[PDB]
Symmetry: C4
Amino acid sequence: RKPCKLMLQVVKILVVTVQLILFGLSNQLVVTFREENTIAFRHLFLLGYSDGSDDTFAAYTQEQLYQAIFYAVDQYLILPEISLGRYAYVRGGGGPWANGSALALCQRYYHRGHVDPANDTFDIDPRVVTDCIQVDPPNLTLKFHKLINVTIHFQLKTINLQSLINNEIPDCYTFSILITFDNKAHSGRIPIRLETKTHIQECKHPSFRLLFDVVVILTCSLSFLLCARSLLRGFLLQNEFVVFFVNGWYILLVTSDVLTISGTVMKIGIEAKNLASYDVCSILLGTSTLLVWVGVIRYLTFFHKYNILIATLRVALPSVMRFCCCVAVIYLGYCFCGWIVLGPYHVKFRSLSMVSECLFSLINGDDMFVTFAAMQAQQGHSSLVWLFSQLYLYSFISLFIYMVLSLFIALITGAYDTIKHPGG
Amino acid sequence: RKPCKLMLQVVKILVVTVQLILFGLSNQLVVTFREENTIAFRHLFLLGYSDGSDDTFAAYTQEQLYQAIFYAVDQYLILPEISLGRYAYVRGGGGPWANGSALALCQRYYHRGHVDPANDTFDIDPRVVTDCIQVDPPNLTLKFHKLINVTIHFQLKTINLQSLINNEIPDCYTFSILITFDNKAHSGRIPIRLETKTHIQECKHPSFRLLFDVVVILTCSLSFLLCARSLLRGFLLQNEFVVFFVNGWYILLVTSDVLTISGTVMKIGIEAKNLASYDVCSILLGTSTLLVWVGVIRYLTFFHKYNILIATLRVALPSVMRFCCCVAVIYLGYCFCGWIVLGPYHVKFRSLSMVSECLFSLINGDDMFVTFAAMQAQQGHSSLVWLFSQLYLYSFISLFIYMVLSLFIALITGAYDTIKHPGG
Amino acid sequence: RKPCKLMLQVVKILVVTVQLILFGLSNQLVVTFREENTIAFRHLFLLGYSDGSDDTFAAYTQEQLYQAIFYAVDQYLILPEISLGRYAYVRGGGGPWANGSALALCQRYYHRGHVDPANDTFDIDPRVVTDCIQVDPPNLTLKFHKLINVTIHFQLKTINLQSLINNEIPDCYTFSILITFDNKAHSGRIPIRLETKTHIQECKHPSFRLLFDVVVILTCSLSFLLCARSLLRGFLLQNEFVVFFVNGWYILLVTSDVLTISGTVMKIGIEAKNLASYDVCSILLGTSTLLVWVGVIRYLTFFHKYNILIATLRVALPSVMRFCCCVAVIYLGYCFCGWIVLGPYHVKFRSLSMVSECLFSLINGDDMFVTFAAMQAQQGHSSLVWLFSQLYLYSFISLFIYMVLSLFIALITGAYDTIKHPGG
Amino acid sequence: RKPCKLMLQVVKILVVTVQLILFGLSNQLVVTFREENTIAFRHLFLLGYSDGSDDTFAAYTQEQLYQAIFYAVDQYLILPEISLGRYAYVRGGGGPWANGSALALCQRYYHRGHVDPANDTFDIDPRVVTDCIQVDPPNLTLKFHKLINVTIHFQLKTINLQSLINNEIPDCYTFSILITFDNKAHSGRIPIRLETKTHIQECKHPSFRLLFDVVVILTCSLSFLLCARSLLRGFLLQNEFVVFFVNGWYILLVTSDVLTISGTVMKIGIEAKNLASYDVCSILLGTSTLLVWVGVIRYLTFFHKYNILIATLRVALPSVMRFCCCVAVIYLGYCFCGWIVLGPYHVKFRSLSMVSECLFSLINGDDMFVTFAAMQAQQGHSSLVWLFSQLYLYSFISLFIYMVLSLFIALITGAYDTIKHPGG
């Protein structure tokens, strides 16, 4: 009934989530097509594209420069001539107007770009002059001092005829190519990178599963109306309590309400500004479905045989707040020691993210023999610091390792006392 | 006697399992020959076969296509001319009839294969036309739009004369070559793959260990008759119990009975439909031999000095069912958060298998510094989601890490209470 | 007030440390420029520089030798001709005087360098003759027996115009190139290595954040005067105690005093002998800021609700000293077994550092499946020792693994007793 | 006195072990020279030697064969012409007599080597005919059916003049080259391998640290006489006990006696049959020095403040024998499931060594996310078995993971009871 409604809401948020696992699969296979297209293009225009070489994909010869310039230039010259597929290159003007390349060959560089590092002086009217080449589907050079960045802005239509294997009509995908030579470092190292964007459109010559998803939304609507009715009844009870853990009698209906607001935003309403907000609304659904797990298990305990382990959770968190506080404060001191020591010989201590990453090395066995062995092997320097890196890292491994069993077990021997009260 | 029969059955299932470790070694060395042949062929026909390049083994040039076409084509032209071994290529017609290549050079592609992705339209009479070339042991081209897949169906006899070093007569192995160009993606990426199958036959000019294995089977027969007699005696006892842990007094005789049915199926009866069912029957033997371990240790406890630790197991599972239930329900919520969050930046969260794989990262130290460090390093996107991936992953690492010591120790401090009852 | 001064000192050492995280970021990005320059140069002069090939960067052909000699020689010939940047090569004489290369092409080798390893004899007047070639910005050979080491000592100015993107004037960086051919092994293997040093100077044509850092120093001065006043008050109390944990009432003011002495040494006083001592003074700050964490959490416990977990620490360390002693003594025996067993088949057991590194394999899951699986796979030798490496490593994994839970839990069940005294 | 003798024996076995760490360093640096020579040679003769390519170092072309044959052949032709060192190639006949190559170019192959794998028959008079070519320091071919293995047996003197940098006279090292083409598989895959052996001799034109080591031996002699006197006194006490843990009152003197017998065997007596027996005697020393750690800590407990933790060890092992028994018996069942399941899709389950290696994956976090993630990714086969590998591996991860905390903590909550008896 009403708990059958709660079990139906667990099952129906679970079924909206099954349709979400379905749609997340559907978008995932679409993204398989996307990533296949991505790697395909990365090889494809990639004059010299090696696996992992995109990390190194920076030029050193100036002739190393202009050659790859020619290389893609021929790529665009003869793409229809060479392709294992069919690319659609119509006018495609960008990114400033006027008019169409479709490949816009653009290049930024400072206007008074005056500089003499042998003279210890420079005259930056660094107003970046962008020089652009439009190139119609059927050679020049720039100052190695002078440039800022170089841009190849092309675009290529394609038909998703593999969708014929998904039983779909093939869609229209315009792959929009931004090729970027980036010499903003100007340090003699200039990475090259290629950006592409796919304008998925339907076929020009041109939904029962869609009816099912909209039903999952409207049933989410009914279930949220149920969750709001239950919040009003618990609100009637709390007004009796003010005028007179399980912890989720109301808030779960709310947080379910929040995940539901996020997913319904994903289907239609924010579903026309697509990508990231859908990713977010599905994120909010992730919290709702975790709770669908946790709270459904609450109800289907059916008291869980008195719920001794469910009773296990309570008084510890009363202490656990300050304890996790204390564990953080030592850890923040240790993160400070990492931010101090990380710069001289490390990449693992490279930022606050990396000081977080070494915290994964702390509790997890994966970071230990790697980091504390390799850094003891001394990339290193300044042999007092070779002593210091070992004396820091071996020191950092120990205190938490000994103390952490004692904390989960100080609360764990605390759990034998709330089980000393509670084993009876 | 009868426990000497149970110890003899532990030893005799252990000896059927020693003969299984023997035969699993024997098949394992045969598979070493198979895998050696596999890598040998993979290099061998492999025009361009690199280690791990089979992962990348997809073409981009159409000329990149037809060249490898020629490459193997010469491979087949002059295999006897080039080989470090001796391959036997007799008529070998397949895979449809008519008649013999031995290399059948086949190629699928849709009949009304009409398509214009610049026109947003297509006319699939996609009825795949398979065009096949037979090629007698002693050039043409296809539409890059038009094809579906391309097949090289060859076959090569060989003699297992290294079996002379195993003291055996060399057997006759016909390696049956299926070379596959797969452009079913049609995304400009077409992986190539080569399949080979070995028809192991005896020498044309043409078993005490075999007598030993059949004895192990018939003695398995006697031991199962013993296990069935013991089930009937325990059944006489249970009929006295109905009419009036150790847990395996009967079921182990049964599950031993099941592993025994599976292995005897492996030797003779299902041993003429070979491969996978033998793998399965040996799987069932694996469960039988684990139990041979566990229950032999039961009997050879001889009460284990009162069996305090054997008494340790019981009442916890009465709670442990619902507890492992609860651990799963949080974990299923966490798997749902993974299925939500995994698609945008990850391969580790790529499927339900990968959400299971990150669960290995949860309890095991190997997944932690890799995943939570590398994903915090942000393949990433959409910096609220760069906050979100860390805020999810660091959140997911903690709750189970703290709680799990408390669970095995909530039942562990429970074990000090069934040892508080039980230490006396 | 005074605890507001202690909280202000926690916040102000925390703010000197926030300015330290700021400066450590600032030096870190400068080091990003440095490392970018480093990898840039390593590719740059690197005739044959491959990623990780610096590990293998040793020659075998003598012609393999002199060619790379020519290769860099042309590198220096035509660096201005080839560069994607602007290098400043003025006279730059070194490393002995007279006068200027700027590339000094030097080569050591023993004077009576007489040797015949077919004759079992040699006449070392091994007085290394250093032959040097100065080479003006706009071929010869040496005995393969005769040389000791070979040196290319060059230097290159450059302007840090990317500092224009940091809003700074570009600084003047003189990159000082030491190219080293090292045949001191004389074992036919001669690694090549290139050293470079950057003399960062300001622009020739030529500080509110600096005012802020000096304020952080002077406020560190006031806070240390506070810490010294508090030590004098606690000293007045201890003189009352002699004449009549929390543990850090005085020593933390001291160790804060030490980190503060180290950082103020970093800003100005030792800040003219820069690199390593600043690294050290920041190290001492790392200890101060960890304590800022730990002791601020002490005060902001505000008794922590009676500080039961803070009371948790005490009596155990009274035992924990001897216990960590005992854990070390077994571990030192195990390190001795490693120093014995490591040499025959291992690199992980390669030194006392590596015997420390296998200790990371002990408690951390990362070293186990790698080392005990790969060494059981037997690089190996002398099959009794193939038994011995497994029998040692599997033995070493177990005793600590079983005992360590019992130690943290012997003290942990000790913590249920100081919580048996202390849960009341 | 006598405990000063025991502390002196701890220190003197520790000093014999310090001289052992010294000699193990000395042999380790000698082995650095050896391994440097090893990698040097591996590149050196290595026509095509790539890092890790020794794993793949097998030929496929027959011309791929004979070319490398020529390649080393020229290696030997012009080694003095090409070398960055000085190799001494005198007559050096082997491995059968007659007379000298120094490169013996040998090749085995069966005498009646008759075989037709197209005919399903063969006539093995497989009596391997070895054909040998001697080649004086200043072309032919064999049947691809016919050969067994091919051998290049050379030898090269060299002088260890880098020992001049160790202050030593350079020794005489004869590097004895065995080059092996191995086609014993005859599977078209023939790995090539090169063996070299170094005859270290002194210089032809030709020990205070040695006096120190012999003193360490004779003092080991005095300390063993002390250990034997202490065994006789404890034997007088045990004869009083028969006629009327600490556990090592006698046996440690013995096991110290055993390690001492092994090391004294290393210095002189077995020190003329060198390599492996010295490795062994040092192994026995490893056990002695571990005990030097453990028992010295016993005495220097000085009762360890009543030795509560030393008292901690005792009664558990009375149970721990059968418990480690039970842990093994489940684990042997699990190893049996691994030996069953490992062959179809795995290399980690490849032998009993690998079933041991997955046991490292069990307790250590390193094997988990790798194996259970990658095998769930399905190298795989036969989708019921794709279910089976996950259903086995995920099953195997759990039971020990839950139970093992309960075992070390069943004995650990047992330790709170021998600390319940023992905390008083």
